[PDB]
Amino acid sequence: KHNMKAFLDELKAENIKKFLYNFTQIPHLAGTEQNFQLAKQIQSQWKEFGLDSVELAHYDVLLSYPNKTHPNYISIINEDGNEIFNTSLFEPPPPGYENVSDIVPPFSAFSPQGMPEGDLVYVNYARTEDFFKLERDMKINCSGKIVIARYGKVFRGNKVKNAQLAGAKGVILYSDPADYFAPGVKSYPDGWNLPGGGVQRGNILNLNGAGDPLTPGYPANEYAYRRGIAEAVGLPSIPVHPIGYYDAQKLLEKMGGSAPPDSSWRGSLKVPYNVGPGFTGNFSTQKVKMHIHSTNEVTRIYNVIGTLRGAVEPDRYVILGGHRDSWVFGGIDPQSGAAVVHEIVRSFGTLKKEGWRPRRTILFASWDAEEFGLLGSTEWAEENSRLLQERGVAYINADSSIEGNYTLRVDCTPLMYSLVHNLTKELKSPDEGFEGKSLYESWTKKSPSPEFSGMPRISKLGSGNDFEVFFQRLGIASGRARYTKNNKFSGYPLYHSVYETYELVEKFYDPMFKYHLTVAQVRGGMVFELANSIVLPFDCRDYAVVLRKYADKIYSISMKHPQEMKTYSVSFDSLFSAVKNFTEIASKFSERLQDFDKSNPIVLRMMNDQLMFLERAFIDPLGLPDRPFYRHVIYAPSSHNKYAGESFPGIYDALFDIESKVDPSKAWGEVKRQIYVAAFTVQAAAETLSEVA
Amino acid sequence: KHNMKAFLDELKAENIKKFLYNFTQIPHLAGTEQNFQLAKQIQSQWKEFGLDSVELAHYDVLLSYPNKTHPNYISIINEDGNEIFNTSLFEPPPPGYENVSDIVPPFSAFSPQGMPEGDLVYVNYARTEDFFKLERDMKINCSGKIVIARYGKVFRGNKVKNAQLAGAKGVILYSDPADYFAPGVKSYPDGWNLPGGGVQRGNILNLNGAGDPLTPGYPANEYAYRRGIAEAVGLPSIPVHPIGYYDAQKLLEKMGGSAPPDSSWRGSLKVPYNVGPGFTGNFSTQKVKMHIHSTNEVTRIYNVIGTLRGAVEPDRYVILGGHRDSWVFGGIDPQSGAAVVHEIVRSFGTLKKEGWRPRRTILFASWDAEEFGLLGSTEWAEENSRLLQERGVAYINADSSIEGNYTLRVDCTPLMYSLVHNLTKELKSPDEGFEGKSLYESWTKKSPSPEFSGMPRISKLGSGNDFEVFFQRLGIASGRARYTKNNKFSGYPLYHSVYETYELVEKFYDPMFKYHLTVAQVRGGMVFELANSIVLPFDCRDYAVVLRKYADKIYSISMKHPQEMKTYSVSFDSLFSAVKNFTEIASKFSERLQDFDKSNPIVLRMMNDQLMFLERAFIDPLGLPDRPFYRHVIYAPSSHNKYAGESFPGIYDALFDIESKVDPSKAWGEVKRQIYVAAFTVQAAAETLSEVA
Ligand SMILES: *[C@@H]1O[C@H](CO)[C@@H](O[C@@H]2O[C@H](CO)[C@@H](O[C@@H]3O[C@H](CO[C@H]4O[C@H](CO)[C@@H](O)[C@H](O)[C@@H]4O)[C@@H](O)[C@H](O[C@H]4O[C@H](CO)[C@@H](O)[C@H](O)[C@@H]4O)[C@@H]3O)[C@H](O)[C@H]2NC(C)=O)[C@H](O)[C@H]1NC(C)=O
Ligand SMILES: *[C@@H]1O[C@H](CO)[C@@H](O[C@@H]2O[C@H](CO)[C@@H](O[C@@H]3O[C@H](CO[C@H]4O[C@H](CO)[C@@H](O)[C@H](O)[C@@H]4O)[C@@H](O)[C@H](O[C@H]4O[C@H](CO)[C@@H](O)[C@H](O)[C@@H]4O)[C@@H]3O)[C@H](O)[C@H]2NC(C)=O)[C@H](O)[C@H]1NC(C)=O
Ligand SMILES: *[C@@H]1O[C@H](CO)[C@@H](O[C@@H]2O[C@H](CO)[C@@H](O[C@@H]3O[C@H](CO)[C@@H](O)[C@H](O)[C@@H]3O)[C@H](O)[C@H]2NC(C)=O)[C@H](O)[C@H]1NC(C)=O
Ligand SMILES: *[C@@H]1O[C@H](CO)[C@@H](O[C@@H]2O[C@H](CO)[C@@H](O[C@@H]3O[C@H](CO)[C@@H](O)[C@H](O)[C@@H]3O)[C@H](O)[C@H]2NC(C)=O)[C@H](O)[C@H]1NC(C)=O
Ligand SMILES: *[C@@H]1O[C@H](CO)[C@@H](O[C@@H]2O[C@H](CO)[C@@H](O)[C@H](O)[C@H]2NC(C)=O)[C@H](O)[C@H]1NC(C)=O
Ligand SMILES: *[C@@H]1O[C@H](CO)[C@@H](O[C@@H]2O[C@H](CO)[C@@H](O)[C@H](O)[C@H]2NC(C)=O)[C@H](O)[C@H]1NC(C)=O
Ligand SMILES: *[C@@H]1O[C@H](CO)[C@@H](O[C@@H]2O[C@H](CO)[C@@H](O)[C@H](O)[C@H]2NC(C)=O)[C@H](O)[C@H]1NC(C)=O
Ligand SMILES: *[C@@H]1O[C@H](CO)[C@@H](O[C@@H]2O[C@H](CO)[C@@H](O)[C@H](O)[C@H]2NC(C)=O)[C@H](O)[C@H]1NC(C)=O
Ligand SMILES: CC(C)C[C@H](NC(=O)O[C@@H](CCC(=O)O)C(=O)O)C(=O)O
Ligand SMILES: CC(C)C[C@H](NC(=O)O[C@@H](CCC(=O)O)C(=O)O)C(=O)O
Ligand SMILES: *[C@@H]1O[C@H](CO)[C@@H](O)[C@H](O)[C@H]1NC(C)=O
Ligand SMILES: *[C@@H]1O[C@H](CO)[C@@H](O)[C@H](O)[C@H]1NC(C)=O
Ligand SMILES: *[C@@H]1O[C@H](CO)[C@@H](O)[C@H](O)[C@H]1NC(C)=O
Ligand SMILES: *[C@@H]1O[C@H](CO)[C@@H](O)[C@H](O)[C@H]1NC(C)=O
Ligand SMILES: *[C@@H]1O[C@H](CO)[C@@H](O)[C@H](O)[C@H]1NC(C)=O
Ligand SMILES: *[C@@H]1O[C@H](CO)[C@@H](O)[C@H](O)[C@H]1NC(C)=O
Ligand SMILES: [Ca+2]
Ligand SMILES: [Ca+2]
Ligand SMILES: [Cl-]
Ligand SMILES: [Cl-]
Ligand SMILES: [Zn+2]
Ligand SMILES: [Zn+2]
Ligand SMILES: [Zn+2]
Ligand SMILES: [Zn+2]
């Protein structure tokens, strides 16, 4: 028969392996011919595999590339203006790829051009708290300095924003072996560690959900009216460039001024990690000079969109999407995910050829330009937002299937928690020592929930991937799953480097493609249940549980300031009341969902619609303050780290560093305003689960 | 049996008459005890009539009232500062009401307090073009002047905004007999004309859809965080007061300075209509002084919400709403509408008691504080916006049932045009000379469509009533219908005066209550069809027809400026393309709607959902420029007259007075931006009617 087991058994490790090999032989950088040819290949194969329709959806968006005949580099310059040290113009290519053309050299996408020259300040990870320590405690002024920051802990766009607000005139990003060289493992090609010549590429925008910097709110189609560059969203104002740790050692070794304030500021290089500004006595007249000549240009990108029409509810969409563009070869990011999607489409297509169709429509997407700011998924969602917000059941992301080989990682809406627990109990663990045990069992053992005994950890969705528009803007229930290591936000060692290849995966991460297969079963199994369960597989009671946890957490932050809460009459009573009501109404809804007359398709659908629009109810059409495309009131990407999720973000940001605000009455008024908005939204979401009339 | 005919035949003229008498014996001003008692009466009666549930929904909103012990008035003051003429402190009460307490004296709701003293300028109707004529052609400067403006043509809030932007320090509004005294009819109590002591009350806010000035975006519930008054939405900055034409004659008779520029500036009083500034030679040292002491205060209001649960689709809402608060007795506005609603509820309830239920849920609303800015409907819709945008089929308004006795007036979405034509062909005309003929026949004869032979005129929805939040903010298909006269925006002569009483209606407008009954049959019949037709009674092809008409119209405005359209490459091609596509897709959708398998309730509902969400597709979640609560891209209230609808309002406002903008490149860029937004929205709406997968 045609059930989930049939679907799951058709998935093959050996197919994922062949697809990964096929997708990682040449670079597939967004906006290049190679990436368009791969799009056309995917489209053809998905048609072959049996999808009803497979189309390319193209957009013309702002991208950024280095100048081929005027390379980016950094120097140490002496008082004469002689360049006595230059950083490398490219990463040494890996074995057997030394003749591959069109490897893009390391650069920070969307950097402006410039040639700033100045004294260095070392700013650790360039986090908000690192700049607080520099400016408040150590009294070091970054104005007119070039800052040097180690990659890790937070999204690099936030480091750049923070440097810019500190008055920096340039930023140098580098990979410290503390964060990108695991002890006892060899550098690529002999192991999975970053070599000293390796460099992490990546964009440095602060889009806050906007998509193409030139067309916020609307798709970048053929007749789009663009903003001028000066009004574009999210572009940095200062030049930025990334380097490897051989080059970083040269720049750091001469640094003078103040000592590091403590050991959390020192990486693993043989240097003092002095904060500066500038170099020690002998070299105090030498400066650092950046040379950045990258250009921003409007460039066509292509999404592949495949449809498998639903037999019963064709107007309800379950979406499996992940990106196809890569920085270089994309051996992990994204092709380990894209190969998994390809095999999922192939398996669904096999069932379709035997006469089966899912209950609801499944949409499959191969997104472009994820690396330049989630541009392909965001522009497509802008184009199709009316269809998605009335018809979108769920979005499952499918970027990198592995970032380690230790255990499963899931980040998703609470509405999916039950679905994920149930599915993982039915899947086999691929882990050594758990032969014949469930994935749920191995995952819960290796990654226990901090709250609940006998449960696995499931994280909040943050951002930095293509689910952002669906979840944070549109309020469609979203999830993601991958295999992971034992700081999650820094990336694995060869992240966004030329060394992330097929061989990296086949030799060091997953030689038997068993972790890829397990990830295909989790993502595919989610999609299968979402598109085929009679009653949507969402449990509203799980949202009630987390809302109480988030309410407790935000109340606790505010309670650091008891005198102000008394003075300005700051009460969380309304939020706790709303959460109590949501808990009560959700419990009654769950009873009706179990009890309702199961022969009545209208009651079922009213109730499926209530389930589908529950995530939608958390959207505030006015958005969060100064972030109009982050509309979800429960979750937003952290204002300090795009990758991390923050709960009750409007109240969290109103409280953050509040003791430093010059007008406390106004600052606490805005806290109260955010409490009202949160309480109201929670109550309004609860009421969507009440009896409808 | 229980069909529409059963519903319609139960409606009785004599019941509407009794209800109107019952609702108009005492004032029902928003926020007063009397209006709360009437709310409680309605709630009790609707329960009696048989509704499933009838609740009050209350909010605490900003209202405005005169100071009882410090009355508002205007003087002419001589050079000594003696007040030589004072305007009246109240309207002479009508016969037999001279002992009614709590008649609010004439005032302009939300005026600030002040005592400005200065020279008068007469500004005709204080329209945008009247101020253009004064300032551009006649070179008269209104800065620091008190302006005097006749009521009529545009909403009074726009007159005040225009006066304020001209630098006026106060505004005096008055009713000219040209606009409020029909030739050959007697003044109240002997006919329906305004007496010289009569005065039109009314608010002067510019809310642009926001609702309560203190809580834009969110309901004014018990825990709401309010804006301070200085940040409130839409409050006027200068004092304003209305007067009758006996008093206006005193203020106008002495005016000097320039002559009126032409006869369209002269009303019917025996005065020159000089524009000023100031008085003629002999009186040139006399000034005009206002004394305004009204106060704004947060006050509780109450909506009554009645539910009649649907038998098949209880999660689909058809809403019949109209307001209950009045300025004084509300003989026409709103109780001629509220009596009609009451009789509709009674008729539906009779069918319900015999075992019938509508297919979809019908919600009935008695809104509060409409007169103070659509506050009750808007706050309730803010509270329930998630329910309404996923479940709202249609909204039928029910304010004044009559504003004349000549013919029917309908303003509605194009989606309702077919429904209205079909229903009116089945109703009897109440008109003299059309005995035994259809309402469609009398209406089409008396009010022919300017475009199509053998069709009646149906207007755009503008605003100035409680459908604004449902249509302009939420995108729920909306309509309104009333009996009317042969300028629609000025109001009938006794509008918002103490003279609008039961006797006015019973003696002069509708002695047999036959026009009330016809209006009950149109509004009730609409609600019946919307809540009971298997397939929703919306025809998308009618939207296609009007979109082409609006595209032609906006193109024609732009084509006044051919040189600029060449210079800045301003093309309407994308908008015409979108409209052509909408026309094609709508035609194919209509074929499927006729042809689809009528035994399949899922296809029916997919298709009912496509019909319901079509109006919703015209909403842009980013709103129009500086008007975030006007989100519909096809229709918005005119920026120059809240009562009037404007089509493609984003492009219309970008083009308006464009030849006066100092930076034409920037002005024409914004035209192009609005063309893109309009073309995209039309295409996106079209695509919601495509096959879903
Ligand atoms: C969690 O869910 C509960 C429902 O179980 C909600 O409880 C409501 O809470 C509000 C605000 O606290 C209550 O509001 C109060 O309403 C009183 C009148 O209520 C009656 O009439 C209404 C119709 O208008 C009916 O809906 C209702 O059933 C009652 O019959 C007012 O008199 C109250 O105002 C007075 O007291 C306050 C506070 O002291 C003063 O500020 C006022 O000036 C005034 O004197 C008040 O507005 C409401 O009755 C409750 N509904 C119930 C029990 O059904 C919670 O609101 C909800 N939590 C959230 C966050 O939404
Ligand atoms: C009204 O409805 C029609 C559909 O009937 C829409 O027509 C589309 O119009 C757009 C814009 O004019 C066309 O866009 C063009 O697409 C070409 C590629 O199209 C093929 O591949 C795509 C997948 O990517 C398929 O969807 C499609 O079926 C085709 O097989 C591009 O090559 C074009 O770009 C080139 O020309 C332009 C203009 O000269 C240059 O600016 C570019 O640099 C480039 O050289 C172009 O983008 C699209 O093909 C049409 N779709 C069709 C016919 O199905 C209208 O857009 C719609 N009106 C509105 C307002 O939406
Ligand atoms: C994940 O799996 C669990 C365990 O199977 C699912 O919960 C179970 O769901 C079924 C079907 O709704 C429940 O059965 C019902 O029991 C009541 C009697 O208590 C009866 O009235 C109903 O007719 C029906 O038989 C079962 O109680 C429930 N078990 C629990 C909550 O422990 C859960 O739904 C799954 N999650 C999904 C699909 O998202
Ligand atoms: C207003 O009334 C008109 C006139 O009755 C309605 O249009 C008519 O609608 C019916 C039912 O959809 C159409 O009948 C169909 O005819 C085709 C053959 O042409 C057949 O395939 C179908 O099975 C069905 O019998 C009829 O053609 C149509 N007449 C027109 C358009 O002139 C209209 O729907 C009403 N508007 C509403 C309810 O909003
Ligand atoms: C990746 O796999 C695809 C599909 O098998 C290969 O593309 C095919 O190549 C053959 C031989 O050149 C052609 O006859 C077909 O037209 C291609 N099919 C397509 C594009 O759908 C592709 O060559 C493989 N790439 C690598 C690097 O191995
Ligand atoms: C670093 O690179 C720069 C730029 O290529 C080198 O300086 C140039 O050297 C050439 C040839 O010797 C001169 O003609 C140019 O005038 C120099 N350009 C600039 C901008 O200074 C420099 O030699 C390199 N330094 C090291 C240590 O390799
Ligand atoms: C308007 O009609 C209502 C309903 O008939 C009247 O209210 C009733 O009055 C009687 C006699 O005083 C009471 O016994 C009932 O309790 C009332 N019913 C209600 C409030 O539902 C009301 O008196 C009428 N008003 C006028 C001005 O005629
Ligand atoms: C218009 O009204 C004002 C205010 O009531 C009158 O002026 C007042 O007259 C009283 C009693 O005669 C004096 O004590 C006050 O000093 C006056 N107040 C002000 C503000 O001037 C005035 O008489 C009235 N004018 C007419 C023509 O009736
Ligand atoms: C490795 C993690 C931390 C980040 C990784 N995402 C990612 O690399 O996306 C890109 C683009 C993300 C964005 O612009 O929001 C980036 O972070 O440079 C992921 O989600 O797998
Ligand atoms: C008589 C028409 C022009 C206006 C009338 N509406 C009306 O009186 O509403 C009030 C409040 C309208 C508002 O504040 O938007 C007013 O115009 O002062 C109606 O729609 O029947
Ligand atoms: C890149 O640099 C070259 C040579 O230095 C120059 O001629 C050209 O203007 C630049 N290209 C772009 C795309 O800016
Ligand atoms: C830092 O340096 C700049 C430039 O010299 C100066 O304008 C600014 O006031 C300084 N800021 C602090 C906080 O010391
Ligand atoms: C794969 O698994 C082994 C066993 O724990 C581990 O030591 C090795 O480092 C893993 N590879 C990666 C890339 O994590
Ligand atoms: C109204 O005026 C009276 C008497 O002139 C004054 O005592 C009171 O302050 C005012 N009332 C309000 C509500 O402002
Ligand atoms: C009108 O009068 C004011 C005040 O005297 C003055 O500031 C302003 O410039 C004048 N405006 C015009 C357009 O003449
Ligand atoms: C009622 O109808 C008659 C007949 O045309 C008309 O002359 C009279 O003025 C009407 N009343 C009103 C209030 O329009
Ligand atoms: Ca865009
Ligand atoms: Ca509000
Ligand atoms: Cl992912
Ligand atoms: Cl109306
Ligand atoms: Zn990726
Ligand atoms: Zn990446
Ligand atoms: Zn009214
Ligand atoms: Zn009114």
B590 touches ligand 4 (CB under 6 Å): no
Smallest-distance ligand from the CA of A504: 13
In angstroms and rounded to an integer, the radius of gyration of the C-alpha atoms of chain A is: 25
- Please give the C-alpha separations between residue A544 and each of A318, A548, A583, in angstroms, as whole numbers: 24, 6, 5
CA distance linking residue A53 with residue A50, whole number of Å: 9
Q: Which domain holds residue B200?
A: 67-292
Which residues on neighbouring strands pair with residue B308, listed in sequence order? Answer: B362
* Judgement on whether residues B597 and B518 belong to the same structural domain of the protein: no
Does B314 contact chain A (CB < 8 Å)?
yes
Is B606 within 8 Å of A310 when comparing Cβ atoms? Answer: no
- If one counts the domains in chain A, the total is 3
Half-sphere exposure of A413 (CA within 13 A, CB side): 31
Q: Where does ligand 8 bind, in terms of residues with CB under 6 Å?
A: B 75, 83-86
Is A315 within 8 Å of B688 when comparing Cβ atoms? Answer: no
Token pair belonging to B87: 């305007």
List all residues of chain B from 39 to 58 with a beta carbon under 8 Å from chain A. Answer: 52
A287, containing H or E segment: strand A287-291
Question: Domain boundary residue among A292, A316, A340?
Answer: A292
In angstroms and rounded to an integer, the radius of gyration of the C-alpha atoms of chain B is: 25
SS3 A425: helix
* Judgement on whether residues B544 and B519 belong to the same structural domain of the protein: no
A249 touches ligand 6 (CB under 6 Å): no
* φ, ψ at B517 (rounded to 5°): -60, -40
Q: Is A632 a catalytic residue?
A: yes
Tally of CB atoms within 10 A around B165 = 11
CA distance linking residue B628 with residue B641, whole number of Å: 17
Is B617 within 8 Å of A386 when comparing Cβ atoms? Answer: yes
**Single-letter residue type at B159:** K
Alpha carbon B87 to chain centroid, angstroms: 29
Q: Name residues with Cβ closer than 5 Å to ligand 23, which is an ion.
A: B 333-334, 399
* Judgement on whether residues B95 and B141 belong to the same structural domain of the protein: yes
Question: Domain boundary residue among B275, B292, B309?
Answer: B292
* Judgement on whether residues B79 and B44 belong to the same structural domain of the protein: no
CA distance linking residue B310 with residue B303, whole number of Å: 22
A113, containing H or E segment: none
CA distance linking residue A304 with residue A37, whole number of Å: 12
Distance from the alpha carbon of residue B187 to the mean position of ligand 14, in angstroms: 35
**Pairing relation of β-strands A392-397 and A360-367?**
unpaired
Out of A58, A291, A421, A632, which one is annotated catalytic? A632
Residue B470 burial (C-beta neighbours within 10 Å; 0-12, 13-18, 19+): buried
Is B621 within 8 Å of A621 when comparing Cβ atoms? Answer: yes
| Cβ–Cβ < 8 Å for A51, A367 | no
Question: Domain boundary residue among A496, A518, A537?
Answer: A537
A192 touches ligand 13 (CB under 6 Å): yes
Distance from the alpha carbon of residue B327 to the mean position of ligand 14, in angstroms: 22
What CATH number is associated with residue B635? 1.20.930.40
**Single-letter residue type at A101:** S
Distance from the alpha carbon of residue B212 to the mean position of ligand 20, in angstroms: 21
CA distance linking residue A72 with residue A241, whole number of Å: 8
| Cβ–Cβ < 8 Å for A147, A288 | no
Q: Among B511, B514, B492, which Cα is nearest to B188's?
A: B492
Q: Which residues contact A438 (CB under 8 A, 6 or more apart)?
A: A424, A425, A426, A427, A428, A429
Q: Which residues of A touch B617 (CB under 8 A)?
A: 386
What CATH number is associated with residue B532? 3.40.630.10
Q: Is B234 left (phi over 0), alpha (psi -120 to 50) or beta?
A: left
Q: Say what the resolution is, in angstroms.
A: 1.6
Token pair belonging to A226: 């663009």
* φ, ψ at A151 (rounded to 5°): -60, 150
Output b/e per residue, A594-612; b: 16+ Cβ within 10 A. Answer: eeeeeeeebbbbbbbbbbb
Is B693 within 8 Å of A312 when comparing Cβ atoms? Answer: no
* Judgement on whether residues B84 and B225 belong to the same structural domain of the protein: yes
Please give the angle made by the CA atoms of A515, A519 and A520, to the nearest 5 degrees: 115
CA distance linking residue B377 with residue A654, whole number of Å: 31
**Pairing relation of β-strands A146-150 and A120-122?**
parallel
Give CA torsion, residues A118, A122, A127, A130, to 10 deg: -120
* Judgement on whether residues B407 and B279 belong to the same structural domain of the protein: no
* Judgement on whether residues A220 and A261 belong to the same structural domain of the protein: yes
SS3 B364: strand
- Please give the C-alpha separations between residue B471 and each of A63, B70, B460, B632, in angstroms, as whole numbers: 39, 40, 11, 8
| Cβ–Cβ < 8 Å for A221, A641 | no
What CATH number is associated with residue B156? 3.50.30.30
* Judgement on whether residues A487 and A557 belong to the same structural domain of the protein: no
Does B568 contact chain A (CB < 8 Å)?
no
Q: Among B533, B525, B502, which Cα is nearest to B347's?
A: B525
List all residues of chain A from 205 to 244 with a beta carbon under 8 Å from chain B. Answer: 217-219, 221, 223-225
CA distance linking residue B587 with residue B581, whole number of Å: 10
* Judgement on whether residues A83 and A60 belong to the same structural domain of the protein: no
CA distance linking residue A167 with residue A186, whole number of Å: 39
- Please give the C-alpha separations between residue A62 and each of A216, A448, A570, B134, in angstroms, as whole numbers: 12, 42, 44, 48
Smallest-distance ligand from the CA of A373: 9
* Judgement on whether residues B79 and B189 belong to the same structural domain of the protein: yes
Q: Which residues contact B672 (CB under 8 A, 6 or more apart)?
A: A225, B568, B569, B570
Q: Going by CA atoms, what residue is nearest to atom 23 of ligand 8? A: B83
Does B21 contact chain A (CB < 8 Å)?
no
Torsion B55-B61-B65-B69 (CA) sign:
positive
Distance from the alpha carbon of residue B45 to the mean position of ligand 7, in angstroms: 10
* Judgement on whether residues A385 and A456 belong to the same structural domain of the protein: yes
Q: Among A214, A203, A195, A194, which Cα is nearest to A159's?
A: A203
- Please give the C-alpha separations between residue A405 and each of A401, A431, B661, in angstroms, as whole numbers: 10, 9, 63
* Judgement on whether residues B210 and B252 belong to the same structural domain of the protein: yes
Q: Is A626 left (phi over 0), alpha (psi -120 to 50) or beta?
A: left
- Please give the C-alpha separations between residue A431 and each of A15, A406, A435, A446, in angstroms, as whole numbers: 20, 8, 7, 10
